[PDB]
Structure formats: C-alpha cells, structure tokens
C-alpha cells in the first residue's frame, strides 16, 4: 500500500519500475533437470516409476489411467461442474474455431499459382499440474484447439494421483492417453517417448519450474520436442480511470496475485485517489482471502502507479507489454487501436480475468515475462502449420525464366540458373 | 553409391535412410561465441570496431551505411538486374500480402465479444552474409514481409565491404539502417543494441557456423532477442514418376546440392529405370558445373530410391518431412492433399526449385532439418504477433458468472471468483 508518482520519479526510478525478476535457473535445477530427462531417455518407465517412488510418492504401476478409472472419476462429478465445463468449452471451440486460417490461393502474375495451407501438427501431449487444487480449465484450453486443428495423437500427462476434474475435462475434449507422471520427467516422457508414453512432435501448457526447465532443455534437443512458448513470472496491469470501481480493479489484481508468487501486479491510474482507494481494497479483500499466502507473496512486488494522464497510461504498458492488460477505463474500446503490445485484452468493467481464464472463449495461455514482444496467445496456429504449395504452367514459367536467369546468375548460382534454361530449351523444342 | 530399391532394404536400413546426421556443436565455437556476444553487449561499437580490426582489411569507421554510398552502388547495377529484382519483389508482395488474416470478431455468447486482431512485431533485424558471391535475394524474401506487416524499424547487417546488389535489395524493400557488421557480432549488435545498432526484437536470415550459433545463443537468452527459425542442413525430395523428364529431375537435386556441402538431396520414384536415367543426368550435368565441389559433396550423401508406387513415395515423403518437395508426376497436384509435411512444395515440370527460390512469390526461408514437424515457411505471421481481446456487456457477464463463479471455486481460485461476485452485487444494487 505504498502509491507510486510516476512523474515525481526520477528517469532511474521509472526504469527501474518496469523490471522483470531477474532470471535464477539455477545450475542445480538445470543438473537435476538434464539428469532427470538423460534417465528417462535411457531407461524409459524404470526411470519414471524410480521418480514415481522418490517424489510424491505414489508408486505408479500402469502409466496409462484406465477408461474404467475414467468413468468412476466422472461419476463422481456434480451435474453443476460437468454443466459449466460445457459452456466454457463451447465458447472455446467457437473462438477458436473462428480462427482457421482461410485459404490463401493466388496467382501472383498469370500462370504462377502460389498457395498457403495448413496441416496440423501430428502429435502433440499436454501438460497439467498436479496439487491439492485442480487446474482442470488448462486441459478445456489445450485439447480444444488440438483437436479442432484435427491433430492425430493428442495425449496428456499430469503428476499421480489425477484429480477426478482433469480426468473428466480430458474425456470431454478428447484426449486419447491420459499418464500418470508428472514434473520434468513427464516432459521427458513426452520428448523422447518411453514404452507407455509417445514420443510427440509439441508439448504445450505450463508448469512449475522443473516443468519450466524441462520445457526449455527438450526445445533444444535435436532428441527433444518442440514447446508452445517460453515462460517466466506470470503479470497483470490494469490501466483505470477516474470512473473505475476500486473493488473491481482490487478483485483482477488479487486474481493475479493468487495465480503465484512471481506473479507481476500493477496498476497504472491517473488519479492518485484511485491508486489509494485501490490499494485499501486490495487489502480489505486480500483479509477474506482463505489461502492467501501466495497473493500476499505477489503483492510485495506491486506497483501501483500514478501516472500524468491515461496517454500515459498506454505509453508504459506498451513498453511493457503485460501478459493480461485489463482496461477498466469508460472509453476502453477506443483505446485498442493503441494498443501494440499484451497477450490478452479485457475491456471494460464487466470483463474480470476470470471471464477469460475460464469461459469467454479466449486462451488463457498466454505469453509472458517480455516475451509479447514476439509471441502470441496460443491459439489453433499453435497446433498447425502453413505449407506453401506452387505450381507454374508453361506460360507462367515461360514469362518468369529470365527474371530467374537473371538472378540465379547475379547471385552465381549456376545450378539453379541451368534448371531454368533446361526448361526454357525444352519448351523451345516443343513450341 | 547408386540406385537404392527401397522394398529391398531391411526395415532398419529403411528407417536409416530417413535419419538426419545430426551434428551440433563445438564447445570451442560455443564459447567463441559466448564471448563475442558478452563483449558486444557490453562494449557496444568499441567491441565490434575491434573486432573488425582483427578480421578485415581495412578497419571499419561508419557503422552504418550512408545514403551516398547506398546511391552509388544503386548506379553501377545494371537495368536487367534492377527490373528482375523488381519483379520479384512484387510476387513476393502479392503473396505474402494475400496472408493477411481476415478479422476474428464473434460473440461467443450474446454479450461476449472476443476477437483476435494482430499487430507487428516492432523492431526486426536481418543478416545477410558476404562473400564472393552476393545473396541478395535473402533480402528481398526478408524485408518485404516485414514492410507488409508494419514493422517500425527494420535494419540489416552484413559483412563489410556490402556488395551493391544487397545495397540495392535494401532499398528497393525500404530497408531503414544497413550496418557493416558481420558473423557473431553482427547477431549480438542486434540482439543487445549498441550506441550505432538499434535492439532488435526479432532476427531474421541464416548464416554460417558462428552466425548460427549466434542466434541460438541469443534466442535463449532473456536479454536475448527472438529468432526466425532453429537452422539446419538443407534439403530437396523429388517425387518422379515415369512421365518425368530426367534431367529436370536433375536440375532440381543439383539446384540443392550446390545450397552447401550438408544439403540433403533425395529421389522417390517407381521406376527403376527413371532412377537410372537421373542418377546418369545428374553426373553429366554436375560435369557443367563451374564450382561443383559443394554440389559434389551434398551428392555423396544422396539417395535415388525406387519404390513400388508412388502412394509409398507419399508415405516416405510424409515421414521424411522434407524442406523442399518436388512433384514431378502426372497428377502432381492431386498428390498434395496427402501431402502431411513439407516446407514448400513444387508442382509439375515447370516449377523448377528456382522459381520458387527467386521470383514466383513464395518464401525461401524454410524449416529444415526435421523442423518441419512443427514449423511453418517463413511468411507474414512471422512478423505479427496475434493478440486477444474481450469485452464483456453487462448482460453477457451476467449470463456467463455463475458458470465463471462454479469454475473458479472448482479449482479453488477464490480471489477469480470472488472478482466474479463482486460485479453481481454491484448490478443487482443498481437493479
């Protein structure tokens, strides 16, 4: 509760402000890591099952949870959750579906006909957490958009004993093999295939820091998988203006703050008696919190910021470039357009994080830690690839011939110029 | 050495003949490389103008490339060189601005309006590498996307002295800034900035050894930058059929063999006669060839495979997963549908490598190296970043809380749920 004046701040000051946690992979969690994933490419389930007997301690037999255990843990279910999964899935699929790519088919000048397409990714595993707490609405996030991208293989691994909601939610979206194994050695899993788990071509959904660190190990490997996105500390900037509701912008940073303690939290208002009346909420509400510890961890990296004016506002978030960018301003809309850097948009003060980390439709796995600056929001492009396709007709080829002698010939490469001109001499012959 | 009859192998020698060589790298260029991309960092233009001294001539001054020197090499270039660039150049702008991707604006539900709109990547670099012989056309396949997508700056590097046919692709592409610096140094002054090289978020274009190493150095660093694409050898799979003139065929293995010594070079066909009679072309058109000893070494690594019929090339093409495919049958075009992975695929006689590599609008900048599993050809979303937004009405938000609220409470997330009760109650209070 300590409100910050951006423009009493000296130029040091400010850049300081923005700062991300410095990076601590730690050599022993990269030794560990690199073990951990050398071992199971070597020895397969002996290892797992060695891991499954060390940590947490489950004594996995058949990696593969049974369709029977399936069914039992769905029964057990209420009709209330199983319900509102559907909403939340059917608002995801329609999204996501919106965003096939159509086709892209043109001739560039008569004759040259040029075409972009997509294929899907062929095999792709997903991760889940485990925990006292199920993260069930990661598996509706990623297996929805997998399977409208019509990826063959789609399976999913989660550290033992699965909680009865990830097992239900990868039923009802379809995932094929759901594993028991969990941390760096399920990512292991996935990237080198063991004689239970298939070696996948991408390994999508976040985790812990093992989890993190194998992510990023296996990316490497010309042995490994590919991996949806880097991570890093996960972060929320709410920009509100005078018309804001304190507690509305208070419930989206506590909302964050629960998320981890290396969550970034930050509010940027023009308004000082906005940021102090924010900050007051944030700490009633933060008082009714039951597990708490964790967002109040989080709060003691917040900034709330006041700054000159709302072009302000969009100045330092767009230097920023915050995982969530939450507008709660009147003329949120009209802001967009200026926006150039977020992985997700919520506008207004009807649209809470939570809307989108559960059931608007849109991804809530998103890019953070500065990487907005290339990445994007998973979405069905993740789970495809373009394919570029060619095909030109004898006139086509007949007109483009010199223009590609010419320059296969500037850049001496005679290979490629003589593959012209054998052509250009056989349509010769023939015309 | 010759003519391989695939049914013939073993089911091991099957699988070996789809392998890559995997090679990766020296300790000593990876420490090399970590140094100069430390001292570049950290000493800016001192480092780079020493490192110059150490490597060129003449030592470097200007950094950057003046709008003079950019006019007098423009000068010297012929018209025929000009106009076939220029062609080019607007295939290239055709197709890639074909790939915009339509708006994504739905409600999900009444009142849940989510979107997907995208924006540019901000600041991109390219590299372009020297030598004798001067690869222009990297430049064009490069800087035209990134002009399609808005990028605000785009610069480029290059091994000084530049030739005047990169100079002028630059300018023709509106490339911003062009600097004489090159190999690792060049990727670090783009990655990290220095007094003269503007940061860059993303690099683009591949290069040798160091230059490689360089970008994957840095794509893993947080104060690192993003890359294009991991890197790899090259490689050409051509489909034959018994319609297929052999030494087309030919022209197009040699076409990527000459690309560099590593340079993958395969041939699928059912008949052994047609094996026989490019295996014969080849060796006479490699005969012709002024600098043949890159294509000659790329070829002891070739493989001319005669299969049963051409739905088995199609099951070994789709496992290979080649960079370039080439179609050279009869219905080419009815092939591509079972066509799972390729970077980019050529279509029937007279869609030479070339044509593609040059001037009909596709992109050349491919995954390789098994990439393919995974990532697309380099296209205009390589140059955006897709963004998501969502905007709730109170009415849309309404009908979606209890949902939200059952979800959050679910995964015991009780600050998202709380964020959810909290608008409740504030609209019931006004109605």
Same mark, same amino acid.
């Given at each position: 509760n300590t409100i910050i004046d951006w423009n009493s701040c000296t130029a040091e000051q400010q850049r300081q402000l923005l700062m991300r946690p410095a990076i601590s992979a730690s050599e022993s969690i990269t030794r560990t890591v690199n073990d951990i994933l050398d071992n199971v490419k070597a020895r397969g389930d002996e290892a797992l099952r060695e891991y499954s007997?060390?940590?947490?301690?489950?004594?996995?037999?058949? @990696?593969?949870? %049974?369709? +029977?255990?399936?069914?039992?843990? %769905?029964?057990? /279910? %209420?009709? +209330? @959750?199983? &319900?509102?999964?559907?909403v939340a899935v059917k608002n995801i699929e329609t999204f996501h579906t919106a965003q096939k790519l159509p086709p892209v088919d043109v001739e560039t000048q008569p004759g040259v006909r040029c075409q972009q397409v997509t294929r899907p990714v062929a095999s792709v595993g997903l991760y889940i957490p485990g925990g006292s707490a199920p993260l069930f609405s990661t598996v509706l996030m990623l297996a929805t958009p997998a399977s409208i991208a019509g990826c063959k293989k789609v399976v999913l691994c989660s550290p033992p004993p699965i909680a009865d909601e990830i097992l239900y939610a990868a039923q009802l979206c379809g995932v094929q093999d759901v594993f028991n194994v969990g941390g760096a050695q399920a990512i292991a899993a996935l990237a080198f295939g063991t004689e239970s788990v298939p070696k996948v071509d991408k390994i999508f959904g976040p985790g812990n820091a093992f989890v993190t660190e194998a992510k990023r190990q296996v990316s490497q490997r010309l042995d490994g998988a590919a991996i949806d996105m880097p991570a890093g500390p996960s972060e929320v900037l709410v920009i509100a203006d005078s018309g804001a509701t304190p507690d509305f912008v208070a419930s989206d940073l506590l909302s964050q703050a629960e998320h981890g303690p290396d969550s970034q939290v930050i509010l940027l208002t023009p308004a000082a008696d906005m940021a102090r009346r924010v900050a007051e909420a944030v700490e009633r509400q933060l008082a009714e919190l039951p597990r708490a510890e964790?967002?109040? &961890?989080? @709060?003691?990296? %917040?900034? @709330?910021?006041?700054?000159?004016? /709302?072009? &302000?506002?969009?100045?330092?978030? =767009?230097?920023?470039?915050?995982?969530? /960018?939450?507008?709660?301003?009147? =003329?949120?809309?009209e802001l967009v357009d200026s926006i150039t850097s977020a992985g997700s948009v919520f506008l207004g003060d009807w649209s809470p994080e939570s809307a989108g980390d559960y059931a608007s439709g849109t991804n809530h796995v998103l890019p953070t830690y500065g990487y907005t600056a290339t990445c994007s929001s998973l979405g069905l492009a993740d789970f495809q690839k373009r394919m570029t396709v060619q095909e030109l007709s004898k006139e086509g080829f007949s007109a483009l011939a010199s223009t590609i002698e010419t320059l296969a010939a500037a850049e001496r490469l005679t290979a490629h110029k003589n593959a012209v001109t054998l052509r250009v001499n056989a349509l010769k012959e023939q015309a």
């Open positions: 007997a060390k940590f947490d301690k489950t004594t996995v037999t058949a @990696l593969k949870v %049974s369709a +029977e255990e399936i069914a039992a843990a %769905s029964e057990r /279910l %209420s009709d +209330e @959750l199983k &319900q509102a999964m559907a964790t967002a109040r &961890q989080a @709060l003691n990296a %917040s900034r @709330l910021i006041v700054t000159k004016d /709302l072009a &302000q506002c969009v100045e330092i978030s =767009n230097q920023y470039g915050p995982e969530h /960018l939450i507008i709660q301003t009147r =003329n949120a809309r």
